[PDB]
């Protein structure tokens, strides 16, 4: 019932054709859980100019999805977030908690 938020980053040199897949298999994770939002706005670069985890600038990705209640579907994600090589950093928080 709650909007979540997931912020991951990918190295910038990849293409848009990579980016569509690399958001839509998280559409696949939210369609196997099913607890998906309207659309995870999962690309919003603000800007990077600092090395947390050894990159000065990649491509931000901000998911921010509604889902079901406090159940398996939320914490299901990160086990399938670690698997991608392209992740630099992800983040997962509720609306205000």
């Amino acid at each position: 019932m709650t909007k979540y938020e997931i912020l991951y980053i990918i190295r910038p040199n990849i293409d848009e054709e990579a980016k569509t897949a690399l958001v839509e298999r998280f559409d696949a994770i939210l369609t196997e859980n099913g607890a998906a939002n309207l659309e995870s706005k999962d690309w919003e670069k603000r800007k990077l100019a600092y090395e947390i985890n050894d990159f000065r600038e990649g491509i931000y990705h901000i998911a921010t999805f509604e889902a079901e209640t406090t159940s398996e579907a939320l914490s299901e994600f990160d086990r399938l977030a670690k698997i991608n090589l392209d992740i630099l950093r992800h983040m997962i928080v509720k609306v205000e908690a």
């Binding site: 980053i9 990077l48 600092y50 947390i52 950093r89 983040m91 928080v93």
Partner: protein
């Protein structure tokens, strides 16, 4: 000369992490936080900001370690 907590200035509640430096002038020049004494903060409302600054310091949107 008021300049306390910035809370009445960004009144209210937003965000407190999706700024870049609008909330994050709470930074020091050395990547750490402004003092709660020099800033002179309202304690748990400072906690209402800093409880997501500690995120937003080290969320790879901000240099958490710096000098000068």
């Amino acid at each position: 000369r008021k300049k306390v907590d910035f809370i009445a200035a960004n009144k209210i509640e937003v965000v407190d992490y999706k700024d870049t430096e609008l909330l994050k002038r709470f930074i020091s020049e050395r990547g750490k936080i402004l003092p709660r004494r020099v800033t002179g903060t309202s304690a748990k409302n400072q906690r209402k900001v800093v409880n997501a600054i500690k995120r937003a310091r080290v969320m790879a949107l901000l240099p958490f370690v710096a000098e000068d």
